[PDB]
Structure formats: structure tokens, C-alpha cells
Enzyme design. Structure first.
Site, PDB file in Angstrom:
ATOM      1  N   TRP A 171      20.488  20.846  -5.862  1.00 56.92           N
ATOM      2  CA  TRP A 171      19.506  20.492  -6.523  1.00 56.92           C
ATOM      3  C   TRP A 171      19.572  18.857  -6.428  1.00 56.92           C
ATOM      4  CZ3 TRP A 171      15.512  22.897  -4.868  1.00 56.92           C
ATOM      5  CH2 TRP A 171      15.372  24.185  -5.015  1.00 56.92           C
ATOM      6  N   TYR A 185      11.325  27.973  -9.829  1.00 61.37           N
ATOM      7  CA  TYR A 185      11.738  29.237  -9.432  1.00 61.37           C
ATOM      8  C   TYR A 185      12.060  29.439 -11.746  1.00 61.37           C
ATOM      9  CZ  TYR A 185      12.746  27.998  -4.843  1.00 61.37           C
ATOM     10  OH  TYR A 185      12.838  27.926  -3.504  1.00 61.37           O
ATOM     11  N   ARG A 245       3.999  48.338  -8.194  1.00 64.30           N
ATOM     12  CA  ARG A 245       3.726  46.901  -9.128  1.00 64.30           C
ATOM     13  C   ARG A 245       5.399  46.211  -9.693  1.00 64.30           C
ATOM     14  NH1 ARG A 245      -2.265  48.040 -12.447  1.00 64.30           N
ATOM     15  NH2 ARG A 245      -2.726  48.980 -10.658  1.00 64.30           N
ATOM     16  N   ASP A 281      15.131  28.090   6.015  1.00 63.60           N
ATOM     17  CA  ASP A 281      16.138  27.438   7.137  1.00 63.60           C
ATOM     18  C   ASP A 281      17.884  28.425   7.105  1.00 63.60           C
ATOM     19  OD1 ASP A 281      18.704  25.886   8.365  1.00 63.60           O
ATOM     20  OD2 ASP A 281      18.289  24.018   6.914  1.00 63.60           O
ATOM     21  N   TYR A 310      16.649  23.714  12.476  1.00 60.90           N
ATOM     22  CA  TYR A 310      16.100  22.538  12.569  1.00 60.90           C
ATOM     23  C   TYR A 310      17.535  22.001  14.295  1.00 60.90           C
ATOM     24  CZ  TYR A 310      14.140  21.933   8.653  1.00 60.90           C
ATOM     25  OH  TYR A 310      12.745  22.099   8.082  1.00 60.90           O
ATOM     26  N   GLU A 340      23.130  28.669  -9.875  1.00 55.33           N
ATOM     27  CA  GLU A 340      22.319  29.333  -9.424  1.00 55.33           C
ATOM     28  C   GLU A 340      20.971  29.833  -9.837  1.00 55.33           C
ATOM     29  OE1 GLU A 340      20.190  29.241  -5.399  1.00 55.33           O
ATOM     30  OE2 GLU A 340      19.730  27.199  -5.314  1.00 55.33           O
ATOM     31  N   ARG A 371       8.467  31.960   2.554  1.00 51.51           N
ATOM     32  CA  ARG A 371       8.078  31.541   3.593  1.00 51.51           C
ATOM     33  C   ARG A 371       8.335  30.512   4.190  1.00 51.51           C
ATOM     34  NH1 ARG A 371       6.954  26.533   2.477  1.00 51.51           N
ATOM     35  NH2 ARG A 371       8.429  25.616   0.452  1.00 51.51           N
ATOM     36  N   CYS A 393      10.517  28.161  -1.681  1.00 59.35           N
ATOM     37  CA  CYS A 393      10.481  29.078  -0.527  1.00 59.35           C
ATOM     38  C   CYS A 393      11.533  30.796  -0.743  1.00 59.35           C
ATOM     39  CB  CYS A 393      12.038  28.387   0.099  1.00 59.35           C
ATOM     40  SG  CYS A 393      12.116  27.158   0.931  1.00 59.35           S
TER      41      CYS A 393
HETATM   42  C1  LIG Z   1      19.470  28.120  -0.492  1.00 62.15           C
HETATM   43  C2  LIG Z   1      19.767  27.619  -1.342  1.00 62.15           C
HETATM   44  C3  LIG Z   1      19.417  26.777  -2.496  1.00 62.15           C
HETATM   45  N1  LIG Z   1      19.598  25.308  -1.697  1.00 62.15           N
HETATM   46  C4  LIG Z   1      17.962  24.352  -2.019  1.00 62.15           C
HETATM   47  C5  LIG Z   1      17.555  23.863  -0.400  1.00 62.15           C
HETATM   48  C6  LIG Z   1      16.804  22.772  -1.083  1.00 62.15           C
HETATM   49  C7  LIG Z   1      16.187  22.164   0.297  1.00 62.15           C
HETATM   50  C8  LIG Z   1      16.324  22.376   1.464  1.00 62.15           C
HETATM   51  N2  LIG Z   1      15.803  21.827   2.490  1.00 62.15           N
HETATM   52  C9  LIG Z   1      16.603  22.286   3.742  1.00 62.15           C
HETATM   53  N3  LIG Z   1      16.940  21.806   4.842  1.00 62.15           N
HETATM   54  N4  LIG Z   1      17.131  23.546   4.350  1.00 62.15           N
HETATM   55  C10 LIG Z   1      17.627  24.487   2.758  1.00 62.15           C
HETATM   56  O1  LIG Z   1      18.082  25.412   2.842  1.00 62.15           O
HETATM   57  C11 LIG Z   1      17.310  24.102   1.689  1.00 62.15           C
HETATM   58  C12 LIG Z   1      17.969  23.963   0.052  1.00 62.15           C
HETATM   59  C13 LIG Z   1      21.030  24.990  -1.239  1.00 62.15           C
HETATM   60  C14 LIG Z   1      21.191  23.468  -1.267  1.00 62.15           C
HETATM   61  C15 LIG Z   1      22.544  23.086  -0.756  1.00 62.15           C
HETATM   62  C16 LIG Z   1      22.442  23.786   0.578  1.00 62.15           C
HETATM   63  C17 LIG Z   1      23.899  22.932   1.368  1.00 62.15           C
HETATM   64  O2  LIG Z   1      23.808  22.050   1.437  1.00 62.15           O
HETATM   65  N5  LIG Z   1      24.884  23.753   1.894  1.00 62.15           N
HETATM   66  C18 LIG Z   1      26.001  23.577   1.359  1.00 62.15           C
HETATM   67  C19 LIG Z   1      26.506  23.799   2.549  1.00 62.15           C
HETATM   68  C20 LIG Z   1      27.294  25.261   3.095  1.00 62.15           C
HETATM   69  C21 LIG Z   1      26.340  26.004   3.085  1.00 62.15           C
HETATM   70  O3  LIG Z   1      25.089  26.023   3.431  1.00 62.15           O
HETATM   71  O4  LIG Z   1      26.507  27.502   1.483  1.00 62.15           O
HETATM   72  C22 LIG Z   1      26.990  22.880   0.818  1.00 62.15           C
HETATM   73  O5  LIG Z   1      26.960  22.986  -0.879  1.00 62.15           O
HETATM   74  O6  LIG Z   1      27.442  21.631   0.933  1.00 62.15           O
HETATM   75  C23 LIG Z   1      22.657  25.233   0.357  1.00 62.15           C
HETATM   76  C24 LIG Z   1      21.251  25.420  -0.100  1.00 62.15           C
HETATM   77  C1  LIG Z   2      12.492  23.680   2.336  1.00 63.36           C
HETATM   78  C2  LIG Z   2      13.286  23.764   3.603  1.00 63.36           C
HETATM   79  O1  LIG Z   2      14.319  23.734   2.812  1.00 63.36           O
HETATM   80  C3  LIG Z   2      14.530  25.483   3.331  1.00 63.36           C
HETATM   81  N1  LIG Z   2      14.871  26.673   1.885  1.00 63.36           N
HETATM   82  C4  LIG Z   2      14.474  25.840   0.798  1.00 63.36           C
HETATM   83  C5  LIG Z   2      14.970  26.716  -0.649  1.00 63.36           C
HETATM   84  C6  LIG Z   2      15.941  28.328  -0.295  1.00 63.36           C
HETATM   85  O2  LIG Z   2      15.821  28.639  -1.664  1.00 63.36           O
HETATM   86  N2  LIG Z   2      15.898  28.203   0.953  1.00 63.36           N
HETATM   87  C7  LIG Z   2      15.681  27.448   2.202  1.00 63.36           C
HETATM   88  O3  LIG Z   2      15.970  28.199   3.551  1.00 63.36           O
HETATM   89  C8  LIG Z   2      13.056  26.099   3.834  1.00 63.36           C
HETATM   90  C9  LIG Z   2      12.712  24.727   4.634  1.00 63.36           C
HETATM   91  O4  LIG Z   2      13.666  24.518   5.814  1.00 63.36           O
END
Ligand SMILES: C#CCN(Cc1ccc2[nH]c(N)nc(=O)c2c1)c1ccc(C(=O)N[C@@H](CCC(=O)O)C(=O)O)cc1
Ligand SMILES: C[C@H]1O[C@@H](n2ccc(=O)[nH]c2=O)C[C@@H]1O
Ligand SMILES: C#CCN(Cc1ccc2[nH]c(N)nc(=O)c2c1)c1ccc(C(=O)N[C@@H](CCC(=O)O)C(=O)O)cc1
Ligand SMILES: C[C@H]1O[C@@H](n2ccc(=O)[nH]c2=O)C[C@@H]1O
Lengths: 264, 264
Positions: A80, A94, A127, A169, A209, A58, A166, A146
Site C-alpha cells: 500500500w 476498507y 441483508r 486488475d 493493462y 492485509e 467495481r 475496488c
Molecule cells: C489486490 C490487492 C492489494 N493491493 C493494492 C492495490 C492497489 C492499487 C492497485 N493498482 C493496480 N494497478 N493494480 C492493483 O491490483 C492494485 C492493487 C496490491 C498491491 C500490490 C500488489 C503487487 O505489487 N503485487 C505483487 C506481485 C505478485 C502478485 O501479484 O501477488 C507484489 O507483492 O509485488 C498486489 C496487490
Molecule cells: C485501482 C486499480 O487497481 C485495481 N485493484 C485495486 C485494489 C484491489 O483490491 N484490487 C484491484 O485489482 C483496480 C484498478 O485496476
């Protein structure tokens, strides 16, 4: 990690129940700050198993300027996919804001090579910022940024970085975002011949959550283990020339993985 | 106040000595956050007399979307003089970004009306943000924003706010920005029929100029008194038509003013 487990216990002891766009429900606190001194070890959570492969691809994708999930698929990353359209596109998120933020008069600013000329020629600058939060393009974006804004600082020949996230999770996203940034800070420090200072993380709406609660208390019952080590086997000509293979993590012994749903 | 005095003491104790752009030299830290519960009183300092007349005309000048010191000279506030040009313009600083952020395609975005409607139609939103860090227009600004980004938040009928300050003159600038933003959370909460919550202040390069050591020691030896109370005497039709007459502070009994040299 001691900071991370302390944060989770803080939104569980001090959080208020909210409601959100994904309709899932959350426990939420507002405003939080923690610090990882990067001389102590690479901040990758040991009380559940994390997947580095997704975090390195990423970050490499962000640094190339790319916002289409084709690169990420080429390398078996699916993090993603839910937010990407028919053509793989995520809109100006980003990678685009970082390498080519559009101006009103048709220019484009590259915020990564700019931060590198500041670290090289003016490291005492107040800066040294990169912002993904361009108000003007938010509507064309798949999800709103985020990890919105971050700033570097140099003190006793060491590079420090503060992120402002901002929305966080804590169970699913935060393990990922703090190892991503700690890795960007070793890459900038390798290129500027500086040592690694600290990664200061700052959160806005920092939440857990509702359908992550039993998992949260399962993790919280574990004793953090010794923190891993980042070995970099090469110094590329530029920050944009890194490859996945140049990165080795040594000493990583996590407790078993904990699975949990992603909000929509 | 106790939070403020502690940071003064953290910078003298822990601060690293840096050479800044004015040649004066600074005692500096990176990363710090302070939380203010606005129910407990208005966060105006009491160990030195702060002057609210400049704090409030500047915030109404910002909400008007004005970037010229003209209105500010009519009300005898001199805080922006040495940075304006020979016509009084500062280029597109704060007010222009807040009221009229320019897209690459011609259009403009009114971030305060955006935030007003989010607090009145989507109060659980984690995107209630206004930013002044426009990377495309930083070249055009007389001085790059020190108070760059902020985020609102609502939990149980209360309105919170967190400001990110990338640069902070602790003795001079910090009492001004705490009073300024705490003042806006009262305006916003009053328009949006909410109660007031915390004011989270986070800073990047937080510093004390070397020629401010005497005044700091003087102020650091004075005991903090009861916080004032803020009264908004009439309820305006919008956040855009408030006036200086509408604000008042009972119970503010401070220590003498303390005169300090400004660095340019
Ligand atoms: C932050 C960031 C980039 N992102 C993007 C991103 C986009 C929307 C979001 N939405 C929510 N609800 N939570 C997030 O943290 C989140 C993260 C991520 C995308 C998927 C996973 C995920 O499913 N987690 C792992 C499980 C184990 C772990 O937590 O690593 C997986 O690969 O299945 C993690 C980060
Ligand atoms: C958009 C939802 O996913 C979370 N989220 C998303 C992208 C990231 O880099 N980290 C993260 O925690 C924020 C909010 O809970
Ligand atoms: C922050 C901000 C906005 N600003 C803008 C602003 C711009 C450049 C700066 N540069 C430096 N060196 N320090 C600052 O705090 C600073 C502040 C301010 C402008 C003036 C004063 C100031 O000198 N306060 C004096 C006198 C003002 C008065 O009489 O009310 C005081 O003693 O209170 C504070 C803040
Ligand atoms: C740019 C110089 O002025 C300072 N400065 C400027 C504006 C403001 O609101 N607060 C502040 O502290 C930061 C640094 O010392």
C-alpha cells in the site's frame, strides 16, 4: 486456476482497448462472474507464485479497523506504500468503513460484528452485507474501494459469499483479492461453526493493462496445478483475535513467479 | 424472455428451501448474472403482461428524490402502500440516497448529477457508481434496498449498466427491475449522446416463493415472443424533467397477465 485463466482469455478475446487515469491503457470487458467451491481447495493461483504473507497481514489489518501502513511495515508488507501519505495514512478506506462506518447522527456501525450476529441468529437473512463504498467519504480516501461490496448466504450448513469488485486488475490484483476473501470466509465459518460454501466473484470493469500482455500470455501457457489446502491450527475467541501463525497452507506447488509493473 | 425463463428453471431445479421473514418459505439460490443486449430490443417480459405504467412513475419518482407515495397515488400506482407510514413517507429509501446522500458533516451528495458529469467529462471512469446501501440510514428505511448498487460503463460510444440485487423475487420483482434499469440506461444514454449497450443484472439471494409455483409452471410453458422497442418521444432539458408521455413501446405482443399473491 481454471476460472482465472478462462477470465484472462475472455478479456483478451472479447476486450476493447480503453484509456484510464494512470494513463497506461487497458484491455477491458464489463460484467463477469465466477465461483470457487471452497470444499475443492483454497483458491490460490498455481500458474504463478503468490505471496500469502501479504494477503494474511492485509486481511488482519482490515479486521482491526486500521488504515495506516505502520502495521503493514511492522510485518514487511509494502503493498500500500505508493498510495499512503507522509504519515502512512490512507484515509477512511476498507478497515474504517468495515469497523466504524459514520452515520449522519454521530453513530458508528460495526459491519463485521453485525454480519456475525446475523450469521449466528438470522443466517436466512437476505441483508447480510458489508460495504466499503461510502459515497460520503470517498474524497478523503487514498484510492476508491475496488472490492466495494460483499454478501454472505447460508444454505445447507455452509457459508457462501459474493463480492462485487467495481474495478479489477486481473493480472496483479485479482489473485490477491480472491485468496483474501476465501480466507475471510474460512474465518467466519470457523467462528459460526459452519462449513465453507462458495466464493462467488462478480466484476465491474474487469481489465488487463497493456504492459501486462506478454506476462498474461506466458501464464496462459501453463497447466494449473492441484489447489492448496488451508489448515487453521486454532479457534480464537473472536474473529478479531487471529494471528498470522494460526494459518498453514499445505500442498502449494506453483509455477515460477511472473513480475509486472503497478499502475499509478 | 429466454434468460429470464432459464433462471426460473434454475431456481426450481437447484434451489434450496429456506424459511424467510414472512413465514412463507422460498426456493432460493445465491449468485446469478444475466446480460441483456439493449440493441436487440427492450427487455420487458412477453410470457406475461407486464404493466409499464408503474415501472415508469416509480423511476421518475426515484429521480426526483422523493420518498413519499403522494406523487405515486396521484398517478394511480399502488406498489408502495403497505410499507409507507400514516403520512405516506417511506423514510430515506432510493430517491433520497440517489439525489441527496448525507455525509457525517451536514452536506449532501447528488449521485445522479455526479454520474451525469462523469459520463460527459470522464466516460472511461471505473467509479461511475450510484449506491443506495447507506449503512448509517438503513434503520431509517421502511424496507432495506433490494436494488442496492449499480455501475455505468462506456466502451465504443455505448452505455452499459450493471445492477446488484441482493434480494430478488423472481416471479414478481425481477420483470419490474429489469424494465426499470433498462429504462434508465436509455434516459442516461439520451442525455449523454451515447448508444445503448448491455444491461448486466447480478443477484445475490435469488428466489421463488413457495406460493408462486403454479404461476411459474404456467409461465414456464409459454414461448417467448419478440422484444418491444422503446421510443423516447422528446428530448428533455435534463434527466430530471422527463414525463410519462415521453415513453412508448411498439411491437409488444405479450401472453395474459398472470395474477400472483404478494408477500409482506
Ligand atoms: C489486490 C490487492 C492489494 N493491493 C493494492 C492495490 C492497489 C492499487 C492497485 N493498482 C493496480 N494497478 N493494480 C492493483 O491490483 C492494485 C492493487 C496490491 C498491491 C500490490 C500488489 C503487487 O505489487 N503485487 C505483487 C506481485 C505478485 C502478485 O501479484 O501477488 C507484489 O507483492 O509485488 C498486489 C496487490
Ligand atoms: C485501482 C486499480 O487497481 C485495481 N485493484 C485495486 C485494489 C484491489 O483490491 N484490487 C484491484 O485489482 C483496480 C484498478 O485496476
Ligand atoms: C421490484 C420492484 C418494486 N416493487 C417493490 C417490492 C417491494 C416488496 C416486495 N415483496 C415481495 N414479496 N416481492 C416483491 O417483488 C416486492 C417488490 C414492486 C411492487 C409491487 C409489484 C407487484 O406486485 N407487481 C404486480 C402488480 C403491479 C402492477 O399492477 O403493475 C404485477 O403483477 O405486476 C412488483 C414490484
Ligand atoms: C424483500 C422481499 O421483496 C423482494 N423485492 C423487493 C423489492 C424489489 O425491487 N424486488 C424484490 O424482489 C425481495 C424479497 O422477496
Amino acid at each position: 486456476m481454471k476460472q482465472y485463466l478462462e477470465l484472462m482469455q475472455k478479456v483478451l478475446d472479447e476486450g476493447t482497448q480503453k484509456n484510464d487515469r494512470t494513463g497506461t491503457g487497458t484491455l477491458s470487458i464489463f460484467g463477469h462472474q465466477m465461483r470457487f467451491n471452497l470444499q475443492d481447495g483454497f483458491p490460490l493461483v498455481t500458474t504463478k507464485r503468490c505471496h500469502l504473507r501479504s494477503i494474511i497481514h492485509e486481511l488482519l489489518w482490515f479486521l482491526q479497523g486500521d488504515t495506516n501502513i505502520a502495521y503493514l511495515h511492522e510485518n514487511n508488507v509494502t503493498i500500500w506504500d505508493e498510495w499512503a501519505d507522509e504519515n502512512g495514512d490512507l484515509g477512511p478506506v476498507y478497515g474504517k468503513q468495515w469497523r466504524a462506518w459514520p452515520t449522519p447522527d454521530g453513530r458508528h456501525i460495526d459491519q463485521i460484528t453485525t454480519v456475525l450476529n446475523q450469521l449466528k441468529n438470522d443466517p436466512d437473512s437476505r441483508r447480510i452485507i458489508v460495504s466499503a463504498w461510502n459515497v460520503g467519504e470517498l474524497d478523503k480516501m487514498a484510492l476508491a474501494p475496488c472490492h466495494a461490496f460483499f454478501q454472505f448466504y447460508v444454505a445447507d450448513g455452509k457459508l457462501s459469499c459474493q463480492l462485487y469488485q467495481r474495478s479489477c486488475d486481473v493480472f496483479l490484483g485479482l489473485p490477491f483479492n480472491i485468496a483474501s476473501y476465501a480466507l475471510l470466509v474460512h474465518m467466519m465459518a470457523q467462528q459460526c461453526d459452519l462449513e465453507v460454501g462458495d466464493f462467488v466473484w462478480t466484476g465491474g470493469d474487469t481489465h488487463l493493462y497493456s504492459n501486462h500482455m506478454d506476462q498474461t500470455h506466458l501464464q496462459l501457457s501453463r497447466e494449473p496445478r492441484p489447489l492448496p489446502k488451508l489448515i487453521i491450527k486454532r479457534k480464537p475467541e473472536s474473529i478479531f483475535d487471529y494471528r498470522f501463525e494460526d494459518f498453514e497452507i499445505e500442498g502449494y506447488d506453483p509455477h515460477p513467479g511472473i513480475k509486472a509493473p503497478v499502475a499509478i
